[PDB]
Amino acid sequence: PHSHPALTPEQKKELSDIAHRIVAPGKGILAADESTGSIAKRLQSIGTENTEENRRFYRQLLLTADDRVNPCIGGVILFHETLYQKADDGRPFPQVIKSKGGVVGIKVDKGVVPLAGTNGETTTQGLDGLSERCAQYKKDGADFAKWRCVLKIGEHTPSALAIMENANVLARYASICQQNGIVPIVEPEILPDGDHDLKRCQYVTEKVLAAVYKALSDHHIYLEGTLLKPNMVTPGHACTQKYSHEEIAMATVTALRRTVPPAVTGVTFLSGGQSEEEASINLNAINKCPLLKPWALTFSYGRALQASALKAWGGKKENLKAAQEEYVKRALANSLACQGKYTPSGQAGAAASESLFISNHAY
Amino acid sequence: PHSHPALTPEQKKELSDIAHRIVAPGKGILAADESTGSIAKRLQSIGTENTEENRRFYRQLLLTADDRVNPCIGGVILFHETLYQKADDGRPFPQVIKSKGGVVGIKVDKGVVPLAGTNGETTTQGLDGLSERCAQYKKDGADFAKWRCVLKIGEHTPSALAIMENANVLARYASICQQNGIVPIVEPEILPDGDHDLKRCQYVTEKVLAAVYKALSDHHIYLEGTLLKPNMVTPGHACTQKYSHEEIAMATVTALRRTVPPAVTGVTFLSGGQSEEEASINLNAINKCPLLKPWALTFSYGRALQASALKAWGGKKENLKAAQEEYVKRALANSLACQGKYTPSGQAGAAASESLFISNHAY
Amino acid sequence: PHSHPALTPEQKKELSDIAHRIVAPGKGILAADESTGSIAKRLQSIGTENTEENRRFYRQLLLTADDRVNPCIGGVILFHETLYQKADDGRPFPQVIKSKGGVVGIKVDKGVVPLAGTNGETTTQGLDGLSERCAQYKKDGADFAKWRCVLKIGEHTPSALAIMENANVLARYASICQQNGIVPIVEPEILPDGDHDLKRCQYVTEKVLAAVYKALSDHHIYLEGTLLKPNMVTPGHACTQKYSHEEIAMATVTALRRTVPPAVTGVTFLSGGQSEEEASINLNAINKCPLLKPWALTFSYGRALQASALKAWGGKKENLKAAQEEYVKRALANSLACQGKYTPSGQAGAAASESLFISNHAY
Amino acid sequence: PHSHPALTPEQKKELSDIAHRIVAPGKGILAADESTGSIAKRLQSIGTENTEENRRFYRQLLLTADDRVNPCIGGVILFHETLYQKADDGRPFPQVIKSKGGVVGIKVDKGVVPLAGTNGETTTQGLDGLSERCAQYKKDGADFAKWRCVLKIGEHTPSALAIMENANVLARYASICQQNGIVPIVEPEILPDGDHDLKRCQYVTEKVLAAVYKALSDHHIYLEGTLLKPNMVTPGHACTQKYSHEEIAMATVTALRRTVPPAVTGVTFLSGGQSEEEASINLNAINKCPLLKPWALTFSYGRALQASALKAWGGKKENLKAAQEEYVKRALANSLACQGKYTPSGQAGAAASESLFISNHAY
């Protein structure tokens, strides 16, 4: 094969620098990129009319939390609407995020679409005019992007077609982003739906990630200028067998070690349906896993960072402080987790220096 | 693998019936789907302002030719704008086309985009919201679609990535079309640009088409409900070595026989940079080639059907009849050519198959 | 994307001529290549010692049948041992086959081996030193070869790996054969085991063959110099739903039309566990199928041609004539079947083509 | 996809333990598996007769060096013949190797063969009966295997076919080895032949390794139970541009970080045509490269450990100690190099500065 450099040394440096800032030690990502339709159910759960104003207010509430979150948040993913909104004082949200040490991200996919001839499987659309959009988003403050592909574990899924097509579209998206100075977060989410066990999820995750990286290679993707947002390896929601956080961690880390090249700058786990606490405990266990991890293992949480805040807010301006306090608490918790220093309840903690090997050959 | 029927017997029948009507014996396709920018230079060559009215008039000129073109035209591809325009008599163009026994086609791709990391290669965009667009186009009179991918023969092209990616996007487009009752014309055009010889074009065409059909298979495409619009196999536009129409026909039919399954309903050749006469002569030779051809071998010409008509018109309303007469001439010529009954002499055949032209093993 | 001719025009001509002779109108293949282990149970069914002499005698019985089989047998597949044995008169068996107008074939695979990590799936070995073996076999009278891959329909099979691996090994085998002037018969047999229906077999057959031909393309195989030996498309053996022969034929022909390039010279069906009569009726129906079939559709039968002869022989020399008469009858029946002229009233077919109330779109 | 465990937890532990022992810190591999035809050339350079005894003696010379090599050699690769030879004291060589703390390896490939339709490219054979051979080698003292695939950098190479096929066969070989308790060393060597520069070699190496690992994933290979033996990334042997050891180290480590999953236990570099000193210095730089390296980076040298020894021996039984001395010196140097603690000076005469490069004798 012959090389026709997709990127210059300067372009590579920029993407790599951005990727590293997002996942710097102790830092993670706040996923606040819900679209109008996606945020609907959540605002409904608190009797709050879904208007641009209330959406702006909620986003402002999260983005303007006190500086304690600064060393916790390396990046914030915004939905198109939000990227162009301003805080009460007139400061554009992108400026607010940056002033606090965070990198601004933008969701660029246009949702999933059904794959004909499959058992309810999908691929994701959004490539049309993506280059122009990325150039504009870059000019308007964004330095990284988000694109979500979705796979499901079932009797005949994910199928060869679903795996191949989703990996290919992720690669196209990644290529377009990098041509525009935008770091692409590659998100091949395997849903936890089903009654399959832990090892089945690990197997599917391994196969999916192997396909993802072959496709990224085929499309000449600069891995150092990318981030990976995968599901943690866990049993299906309806699985009857029970597992410990250490087992989930071992399966998760083993799967990543067998598929993700060291060159990938970081892994920002999606939390799916996990509760705030569960997502923090699992990430902590993941970082405490004895095995060698050559990439940052952090978070890219939506619900896992907003659940309590959304409830505390309830749509009342008077609850601004209370709501922000809940968000700050999860930001702090997860900052400790991505460093393996989180401990669920108490306020004493501070202890983390010892490791030994026992049984990972079972994975 | 497991089957999850992409189409019901009814949907299959609908698609197969449409595909067969388009390429019925003696029928071909008029490709009049040039976009505003694509038709610009065309009108510019005849000193005619590229306005909606002039474009509307030119299309009217072609679509309203006498009933003599009826047995010659099985389908007409239109650009979005034209699908929603009307003739002077108030009839929408789709109705005009249909009353003459032709099937209405609509171009749905959104142009080519550069593939990063390649030597100027491209893929094609246009999948976003394609399903909704197809459902609407169907409702407005269209029964088939057009999507053009472009590949180029060079020192390092077409690359593995270009072949793989273009084949994949064509399959995605085809899949979406069939879900909406639209017959997709799969167009993987290999440009004639360059000084490569006939053997090289045949080689590249064979590898490209093998990739295209494997992709269509992977995406569960119903071949009977599709058509193929490939480049004929010819030497490069600047190849110093010269060839006969019989050699082009042999190279073309051999390439297709080695890659296109018999289930494909028809092959509608693009004319590329060929003149009106050349395109008719090559198509005729292709149909006279002494090899078994399990699919209709006809035309889907743009320039090869409009060149003279455009020039005769010259943008002057009073040249309507003279311009349409020219179009009818090429329509009738190609109608005979797709049956192997064309002779540049005049009407009927006078120059048939000679003899002793063996050694097809040299291809 | 560059060509480096694997074969010269002369080599292509030789391979194409050989392939055509084997499947010439009315001719099929006698598969008598059972190894010592495979023929053991065959001999014990008639209480006969599995000695080289009895094997030679049995093969001789079939190869020296009267001249009535000449127009019926275009090729005879032999096991290594047999290729070097002689008839009572001292004539090498390959000479015997050739004098009767048959082409000599040789099995070159070395059996199946388990694919680790699969549910009882296999690939086939035999590539080591295969080029040298082919050159020797060619010198010793053989012009075509046999290589069998086996796939099974089950809950998770054929798997992506199994399909990809078997298709790849068949391509390597075919490439080596063509380099030595040997026509390779590509045999990707999908076993009839299981309770799946006709539709599922057709689906799997379609996916398998699509993979086979993409692999042949990737390995630069000259299709005109090859033959295909696939399973007919039938319901599983344990399938509770019944099907007519016309349905088997429609499913079979449809699958082939959707995957086998017309350049392939011929298709020689394996009969699996079908009875002698069943295999003839099905092949006849296949040739009677009203769809366009661009390749010869004939037989490559083992059991379907030897069952009765083996029984009639019983291992007793005095039964030679009786045994040979049984083989000749099946050779005649299938010769008519591969022309669609078979009837339980052989040598006098005329009245045919009755019904019409059908729907190919149901396939 | 579905999991059908290729290995039990016990089998994985055995393979993992073996792999780790071979590349334990400070340890490397002595590749003394030259076939008789290959070693005959080196014995020829010293006017020594290529007899079984001479070969036995030479191998004994290397395998029985003093205990100073013990901490340096984690593994020794042998050719079939040597595996069944004994030292002067009657001890089988495998026992000799084990008593010194080394793991015994066996070459199992049967050499390269030409890929038809390519520009002098090859694949490698040796799969036939490999399972039975591994089981026997395991019983006879071997715990790991060696299989070499060869690729060349040129205008059209390595081709898509060559990359795909070589990656696939390496995967089949690895699969069979693991089923028999043998650790497979995956060796996809990209020859240094040519005038290409460093970045071109890096590009090709990245593409080749990406293909190798995708194939290993497709074939369900347990990476923790494998080792990788790739070429270091260097400019072509005929490249005009000069590079430093730091640059070679940077390109090599970067290519590996972009393709080799952290789960791979170790990388044992081949030296190609590098001199004994050149190979040690580059390995040292590789280990000193400032990038994160999640796998052991050591050696698997043949001539790079035998050059001086072979020259000092000269086929004279009295030069035993002299020869061994040269070998121990190189073993020590590389032992320090794989820990990034090597620094040269005077030692290792001109025989260690001579290029051990020999153009690929084929095309």
Domain ranges for chain A, please list them: 1-363
Considering the candidates B27, B138, B146, B229, report the single residue annotated as catalytic.
B229
Q: Which residues of C touch B214 (CB under 8 A)?
A: 210-211, 213-214
Please tell me whether residue C190 adopts helix, strand or coil conformation: strand
Structure-block tokens of residue D61: 């010379």
Q: How far apart are the first and last CA of chain C?
A: 37
Residue A20 half-sphere exposure toward CB, CA atoms < 13 A? 8
Does D271 belong to an annotated binding site? Answer: yes
Do B310 and B44 form a contact (C-beta atoms < 8 A)?
no
Cβ of A294 within 8 Å of Cβ of D262? The answer is yes
Structure tokens at C286: 């296949």
Say what the alpha-carbon torsion angle B357, B358, B360, B362 is, to the nearest 10 degrees: -100
What is the SS3 assignment for B187? strand
Question: Which residues on chain C are in Cβ contact (under 8 Å) with D123?
Answer: 172
Is C113 close to D131, i.e. CB distance below 8 A? yes
- Largest separation between any pair of C-alpha atoms in chain C: 63
Q: What are phi and psi of A227, to 5 degrees?
A: -135, 155
Annotated catalytic residue, options C138, C229, C288, C341: C229
Query: How many Å separate Cα A223 from the centre of its chain?
Result: 16
**Rounded-to-integer distance, Cα D77 and Cα D29, Å:** 7
Hey, which residues 229-258 in chain D have their CB within 8 Å of chain A?
254, 256-258
Chain C residues whose CB is inside 8 A of the D156 CB are: 2, 4
In this structure, which amino acid lies at residue D295? W
Residue located via tokens 């004098």: C99
Closest listed residue to residue D186, CA positions, set D136, D240, D233, D147 = D147
Q: How far is CA A118 from the centre of its chain?
A: 27
Distance CA B127, CA A236 (A): 32
Is there a contact between A3 and D199 if contact means CB atoms under 8 Å apart?
yes
Residue A158: both structure tokens together: 């994910």
| B214–C210 C-beta distance less than 8 A | yes
Which residues sit opposite C38 in a β-bridge? none
CB atoms within 10 A of CB D288: 16
Q: Which chains touch D (3 or more CB pairs under 8 A)?
A: A, C
Chain B contacts of C215, Cβ < 8 Å?
none
Is C229 catalytic? The answer is: yes
Q: Name which of C236, C248, C243 is nearest C194 in CA terms.
A: C236
Interface test with D, best of A7, A203, A217 (most D CBs within 10 A): A217
Q: What is the torsional sign of CA D249, D251, D252, D253? A: positive
CA distance D339 to D321: 27
Pairing of strands D112-114, D183-190: unpaired
Residue of A357, A254, A331, A344 whose CA lies nearest to A27: A331
Compare CB distances from B168 to A126, A168, A178 and report the shortest one's residue: A168
Torsion from C-alpha of B33, B38, B41, B46, nearest 10 degrees: 10
Helices C52-63 and C320-337 cross at an angle (nearest 10°) of 50
Query: Which regions of A210-363 does DSSP assign to beta strands (E)?
Result: 227-228, 266-269, 296-301
User: What DSSP element (H or E) covers C112?
Assistant: strand C112-114
D138 counts as catalytic = no
Work out how many CB contacts closer than 8 A connect C with D.
82
Region at C122 (left for phi over 0; alpha for psi -120 to 50; beta for the rest): beta
Q: Which residue has the tokens 């992506």?
A: C160
Q: Residue A46: CB partners within 8 Å, gap ≥ 6?
A: A310, A311, A313, A314, A315
Q: Are C363 and C202 in contact (CB under 8 A)?
A: yes
List helix spans (H) across chain D.
9-22, 36-44, 52-63, 80-83, 93-99, 130-139, 160-178, 198-218, 245-257, 276-288, 303-313, 320-337
Beta strands in A108-182 (DSSP E): 112-114, 122-124, 144-151
Distance linking the first and last C-alpha atoms of chain B: 36
Q: From chain B, pick out residues whose CB is under 8 angstroms from the CB of C200.
A: 2-3
Residue of B258, B297, B358, B363 to mutate, interface with C, max C Cβ within 10 Å: B258
Partners of residue D31 on adjacent β-strands: D77
Cβ–Cβ of A118/B4 closer than 8 Å?
A: yes
Q: Structure resolution in Å?
A: 1.8
Nearest to A166 by CA among A232, A113, A236, A231: A113
Q: Which residues of A are less than 8 Å from B133 in CB distance?
A: none
Structure tokens at D123: 């694949």
Closest chain B CA to residue A217: B161
A119 interfacial to chain D (CB closer than 8 Å): no
D296 sits in which H/E element: strand D296-301
Q: Is B223 on the interface with C (CB under 8 A)?
A: yes
CA angle (A298, A300, A306) in 5-degree steps: 120
To the nearest 10 degrees (0 to 180), the angle between helices C160-179 and D198-218 is 120
Sequence-ordered strand ranges (E) for B60-131: 73-78, 103-107, 112-114, 122-124
Residue D76's nearest CA partner among D331, D322, D354, D333 is D331
Taking phi over 0 as left and psi of -120 to 50 as alpha, with beta for the rest, B129 belongs to left
Q: Which of A163, A164, A361 to mutate to test the interface with D (most CBs of D within 10 A)?
A: A361
Out of D3, D214, D217, closest to residue A200 by CB: D3
| Residues contacting D265, CB < 8 A, separation 6+ | D16, D19, D20, D23, D223, D224, D225, D226, D227, D295, D296
Of A210, A261, A262, the CB nearest to D217: A210
CB under 8 A, 24+ apart: contacts of A32-37: A32/A59, A32/A62, A32/A63, A32/A76, A32/A77, A32/A78, A32/A79, A32/A82, A32/A302, A32/A306, A33/A77, A33/A78, A33/A79, A33/A82, A33/A105, A33/A106, A33/A107, A33/A146, A33/A302, A34/A79, A34/A302, A35/A79, A35/A107, A36/A81
Compute CA distances D319 → A256, D96, D309, D313, whole Å.
Answer: 52, 21, 10, 5
Q: Which residues contact C244 (CB under 8 A, 6 or more apart)?
A: none
Kindly state the tokens that stand for B26.
């003696």
Query: What would the two tokens of residue A95 be?
Result: 């400026």
Structure tokens at D266: 């170790």
Judge: D217–A204 Cβ closer than 8 Å, yes or no.
no
C116, D68, D75, D141, D176 from D101: Cα distances, Å: 31, 11, 8, 13, 26
Q: What string of DSSP letters covers B14-62?
A: HHHHHHHHHT-TT-EEEEE---HHHHHHHHHTTT----HHHHHHHHHHH
Cβ neighbour number for residue B66 with a 10 Å cutoff: 12
d(CA D44, CA B181): 74
C-beta of residue C46 within 8 angstroms of C-beta of residue C315: yes
D159's CB contacts (< 8 A; 6+ apart) are D118, D119, D121
Cis peptide before D94 (omega within 30 of 0): no
Smallest Cβ–Cβ distance between D156 and the set C2, C165, C172 belongs to C2
Phi and psi at residue A347, to the nearest 5°: -125, 25
For chain B, positions 175-214, list CB contacts with chain A under 8 A: 175-176, 178-179
| D82 SS3 class | helix
- CATH class of domain segment(s) D1-363: alpha beta
CA distances from D107 to A176, B115, B197, C288, D53 (A): 45, 43, 46, 55, 20
- The position carrying tokens 């992409």 is B6
Q: Does A293 contact chain D (CB < 8 Å)? A: yes
User: For helices D36-44 and D52-63, what crossing angle results, to 10°?
Assistant: 80
Distance CA A80, CA A140 (A): 11
What whole-number distance in Å separates Cα of residue D6 and Cα of residue D8?
7
- B20 contacts chain C (CB < 8 A): no
| Environment class of D78 (CB within 10 Å of its CB; exposed 0-12, middle 13-18, buried 19+) | buried
Q: Which two tokens stand for residue D275?
A: 């001199």
CA-CA distance, C12 to C10, in Å (whole number)?
5
Break chain C down into helix, strand, coil percent, rounded to 5.
Answer: 45, 15, 40
Q: Which of A28, A91, A57 is nearest to A316 (CA)?
A: A57
DSSP C293: -
Question: What is the residue type of A193?
Answer: D
Distance CA D160, CA C2 (A): 11
Which of A124, A33, A117, A16 lies closest to A81 in space, CA to CA?
A33
Residue at D277: amino acid letter: E
Tell me: is residue A303 an annotated ligand-binding position: yes
Burial D45-71 (b: 16+ CB within 10 A, else e): eeebeeeeebbbbbbbbbbbbeeebbb
Query: What's the rounded Cα separation, in Å, for the pair A275 and C225?
Result: 63
In angstroms, what CA-CA distances link A231 with A182, C91, D194?
Answer: 23, 70, 45
Q: How far is C169 from D248, CA to CA, in rounded Å?
A: 37
Would you call the peptide bond into C158 cis, given omega within 30 degrees of 0 as the criterion? Answer: yes
**B210-247 burial: b if 16+ Cβ within 10 Å, else e:** bbbbbbbbbbbbbbbbbbbbbbbbbbbeebeeeeebbb
